[PDB]
Amino acid sequence: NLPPHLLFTQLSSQYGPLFGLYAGPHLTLVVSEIGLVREVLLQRGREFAGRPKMVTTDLLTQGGKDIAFADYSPLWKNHRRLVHSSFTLFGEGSNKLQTIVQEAADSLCEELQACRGQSSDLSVVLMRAVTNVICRLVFSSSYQPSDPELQTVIQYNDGIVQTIARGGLVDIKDLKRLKECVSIRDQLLYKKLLEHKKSLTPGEPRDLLDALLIGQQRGSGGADDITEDHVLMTAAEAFGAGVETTSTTLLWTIAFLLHHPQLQERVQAELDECVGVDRPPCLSDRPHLPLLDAVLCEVMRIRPVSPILIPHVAMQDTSLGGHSVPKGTRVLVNMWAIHHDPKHWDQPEQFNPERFLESSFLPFGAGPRVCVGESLARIELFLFVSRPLQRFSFSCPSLPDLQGRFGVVLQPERYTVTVTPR
Ligand SMILES: CC(=O)[C@H]1CC[C@H]2[C@@H]3CCC4=CC(=O)CC[C@]4(C)[C@H]3CC[C@]12C
């Protein structure tokens, strides 16, 4: 009838913004209002920082050794501290990410030239580009578009997406097809991991994978220290969490610029004044591109990639609203609600980047469980989007459907778009 994110958004008007669903022994709360969600993420962030141990996830994360589906704990804090710093170093700390992402936007731009004068479907092409970026950032891969090993990775990532899309988080088989995908994935990375452990300079540099292995190098004894399996799982997750979210956010951006050609022209003016028409845009231009940033913020608001977050589990007996919340309780954060709440947003259903130009905006979550790839994401999307807008104009050749479909993320239905440069 109606997807859960809209259903509970819709019920929040008449009945409350906190809803309790029952199934089996576990209570499941759904939270559709900013104060409540802030209570879960920030205010009692630590209490609700647990994750649920499903069987798909176990396969995925070799038993909860990743970041996303592991419980808050001494081991998980060191692990994430290790991760967070790794990313910071590659993005803010220097220009390895900038370079990776610029040089990839080249390839992407080049691929698009050749697609003129078609009414191409991009999505594959972008998928490729963001996947390549993450291959680069994690292994120092040097694949070009045609490369078969890159093609392997997209194919096992793709299989995992397809598999999960049909089936379970079981919030609210064929589980063998995942194991298969997972195995080829686990092996290929491990190989890369072996290749990396052999050539390893701690001072620096040269890779997210290096950076974890160093961190794991410094690994006194069991209790709260990361094994090597977490390194591998964290590398796998950089794709798992990073590709489909980033590619989709790009797919929406473009989808919306088709509906708003004027706005696409306005951002293109911004780029022309501020950046050359030759120079590639780089991170230092960010402050000087206020509209673009607005556009990006708006896309992330209006079509949240995960309109319901992965559950937050109640680590101890706690409370929410003024209501007690037993240990083990699952809490679904309704990202669509808080991003479409008319109490907090004027014309929340209209695409208006100007609303970010002049509070309950949490595109990356927040609190202990906040996105660990936020800095990387933001840089990815800035760099990617400035370049194609600088080099290309995207028009309709009937306009794409902006409702959205739920794969493993919320995403627009496949569309054709005319791609035209200068
Ligand atoms: C909540 C969020 O936006 C991110 C954080 C972790 C991410 C998940 C991590 C596991 C995963 C692996 C994949 O290969 C596909 C997408 C999924 C299913 C990811 C969907 C987006 C998630 C759920």
Side-chain angles (χ1 to χ4, degrees), residues 2-422:
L2 194 63
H5 64 286
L6 299 179
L7 190 264
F8 297 106
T9 293
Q10 220 148 291
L11 302 189
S12 301
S13 322
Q14 40 232 327
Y15 310 97
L18 180 65
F19 255 81
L21 307 160
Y22 298 77
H26 299 290
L27 166 60
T28 295
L29 271 12
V30 184
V31 190
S32 300
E33 185 277 319
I34 184 64
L36 291 164
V37 327
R38 291 186 102 88
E39 191 175 348
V40 179
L41 296 181
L42 276 329
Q43 191 194 309
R44 352 204 102 129
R46 299 191 272 89
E47 288 93 300
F48 286 115
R51 298 296 205 194
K53 181 200 242 296
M54 307 161 187
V55 158
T56 53
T57 59
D58 271 352
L59 295 177
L60 252 34
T61 64
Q62 211 162 303
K65 297 190 169 67
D66 71 337
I67 296 298
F69 295 104
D71 260 354
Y72 183 92
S73 59
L75 173 53
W76 179 96
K77 314 214 300 265
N78 301 332
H79 180 192
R80 186 205 191 280
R81 185 174 329 111
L82 175 58
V83 175
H84 168 85
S85 108
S86 307
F87 284 118
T88 303
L89 160 58
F90 288 69
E92 164 82 44
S94 302
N95 41 355
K96 193 192 155 85
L97 178 62
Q98 187 172 232
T99 284
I100 293 167
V101 176
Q102 272 164 350
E103 269 180 296
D106 280 319
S107 295
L108 172 58
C109 284
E110 290 239 320
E111 288 214 48
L112 292 154
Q113 292 287 358
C115 80
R116 155 139 99 84
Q118 317 320 346
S119 294
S120 180
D121 177 283
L122 33 60
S123 174
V124 175
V125 310
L126 298 179
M127 261 289 317
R128 197 176 288 120
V130 328
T131 308
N132 215 340
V133 168
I134 304 279
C135 304
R136 265 260 245 167
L137 175 59
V138 179
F139 339 141
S140 295
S141 94
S142 210
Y143 309 135
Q144 266 151 342
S146 79
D147 192 288
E149 190 176 55
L150 161 67
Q151 202 51 42
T152 294
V153 171
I154 281 80
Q155 293 312 98
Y156 66 66
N157 284 338
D158 191 57
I160 291 176
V161 173
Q162 222 226 62
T163 305
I164 292 164
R166 296 179 299 205
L169 291 166
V170 209
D171 77 29
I172 292 160
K173 56 197 46 181
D174 158 50
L175 306 325
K176 273 66 165 173
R177 215 267 143 152
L178 186 78
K179 294 200 294 228
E180 287 188 356
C181 291
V182 155
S183 187
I184 280 165
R185 178 209 70 168
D186 287 355
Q187 293 161 56
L188 192 141
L189 272 43
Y190 188 64
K191 163 172 167 215
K192 216 67 225 231
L193 169 31
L194 264 18
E195 294 184 320
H196 276 69
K197 206 208 306 166
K198 65 148 171 82
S199 275
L200 196 58
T201 304
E204 332 201 56
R206 63 259 178 88
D207 249 335
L208 199 147
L209 199 58
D210 268 56
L212 294 167
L213 287 166
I214 308 320
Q216 190 268 344
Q217 246 206 84
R218 318 166 73 127
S220 51
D224 313 337
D225 283 355
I226 61 165
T227 110
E228 227 174 58
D229 293 338
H230 299 102
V231 179
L232 190 73
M233 294 301 91
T234 296
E237 192 145 276
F239 297 90
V243 168
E244 201 90 27
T245 52
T246 43
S247 321
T248 296
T249 307
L250 298 168
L251 279 166
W252 276 123
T253 296
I254 281 159
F256 275 104
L257 295 168
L258 262 55
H259 286 238
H260 297 86
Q262 67 290 324
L263 181 54
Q264 174 178 179
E265 273 162 85
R266 289 170 56 213
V267 172
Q268 278 157 347
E270 200 176 59
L271 281 163
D272 298 342
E273 301 146 341
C274 318
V275 191
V277 81
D278 45 354
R279 193 168 57 81
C282 51
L283 302 175
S284 74
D285 302 303
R286 285 187 91 152
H288 305 296
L289 303 179
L291 190 64
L292 178 43
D293 194 73
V295 168
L296 291 180
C297 285
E298 181 74 343
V299 163
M300 284 173 165
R301 198 207 89 242
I302 197 177
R303 294 283 181 279
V305 287
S306 306
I308 289 182
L309 306 182
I310 306 151
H312 276 69
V313 182
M315 297 273 291
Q316 78 189 26
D317 291 340
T318 169
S319 105
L320 213 179
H323 306 269
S324 104
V325 184
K327 178 166 160 189
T329 300
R330 293 189 170 185
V331 170
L332 301 186
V333 164
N334 187 352
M335 202 110 291
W336 176 279
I338 53 160
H339 286 163
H340 280 68
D341 190 347
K343 200 118 164 157
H344 299 285
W345 301 95
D346 186 85
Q347 280 197 346
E349 296 143 312
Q350 208 180 302
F351 188 99
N352 191 323
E354 298 122 326
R355 100 214 306 144
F356 284 98
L357 295 173
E358 187 254 42
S359 95
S360 78
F361 188 54
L362 298 161
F364 295 93
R369 283 293 166 160
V370 62
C371 188
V372 294
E374 180 180 5
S375 303
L376 187 148
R378 286 179 170 280
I379 282 160
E380 232 177 340
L381 301 158
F382 169 79
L383 260 22
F384 262 138
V385 187
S386 51
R387 208 139 176 205
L389 294 187
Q390 172 193 59
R391 303 221 343 192
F392 304 106
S393 214
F394 301 80
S395 67
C396 40
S398 161
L399 293 157
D401 190 23
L402 301 167
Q403 172 207 324
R405 182 108 79 73
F406 191 75
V408 312
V409 288
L410 177 75
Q411 67 196 333
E413 312 229 319
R414 194 171 169 77
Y415 57 92
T416 69
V417 38
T418 293
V419 194
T420 330
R422 185 184 273 106

